[PDB]
Write a protein that binds this ligand. Structure first.
Ligand SMILES: COC(=O)[C@H](Cc1ccc(C#Cc2ccccc2)cc1)NC(=O)C[C@H]1CCCN(C(=N)N)C1
Length: 123
């Protein structure tokens, strides 16, 4: 169908966005980089379905905050939330369960990139 292709493209949109953020870190200078890597993110116990994207949405402000510190962030984050909403819908309710261990921004992005890739692969 073309509804499934819509979902694929939205996931690819989210994935590229997250990948662009990750790639940007490679240029940050040490003082900045060192500080930025001590800012913790919460990781979901489980993220294998679209509804789990809520656990990424919840961590979007913290993502925006740390990114403002290291620089338009408001615009990119808002675009990610728009895609997140389009992908999961607002009808599904879900309560995020986070692991005990928090993660760096690099680990947080890698996990959500893997997530996007994973859903793509199933369709
Ligand atoms: C008790 O809180 C902490 O130990 C540090 C503290 C912190 C704050 C800001 C920074 C920074 C920076 C930075 C980045 C780039 C350039 C210059 C400075 C680093 C560590 N903060 C964090 O771990 C971020 C998380 C705090 C709790 C809630 N939140 C979350 N992921 N839900 C974010």
């Amino acid at each position: 169908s073309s509804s499934t292709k819509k979902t694929q493209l939205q996931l690819e949109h989210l994935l590229l966005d997250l990948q662009m953020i990750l790639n940007g870190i490679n240029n940050y200078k040490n003082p900045k980089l060192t500080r930025m890597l001590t800012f913790k993110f919460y990781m979901p116990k489980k993220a294998t379905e679209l509804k789990h994207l809520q656990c990424l949405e919840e961590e979007l402000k913290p993502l925006e905050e740390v990114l403002n510190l290291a620089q338009r962030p408001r615009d990119l984050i808002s675009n990610i939330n728009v895609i997140v909403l389009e992908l999961k819908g607002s009808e599904t309710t879900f309560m995020c369960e986070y692991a005990d261990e928090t993660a760096t921004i690099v680990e947080f992005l890698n996990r959500w990139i893997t997530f996007c890739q994973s859903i793509i692969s199933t369709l």
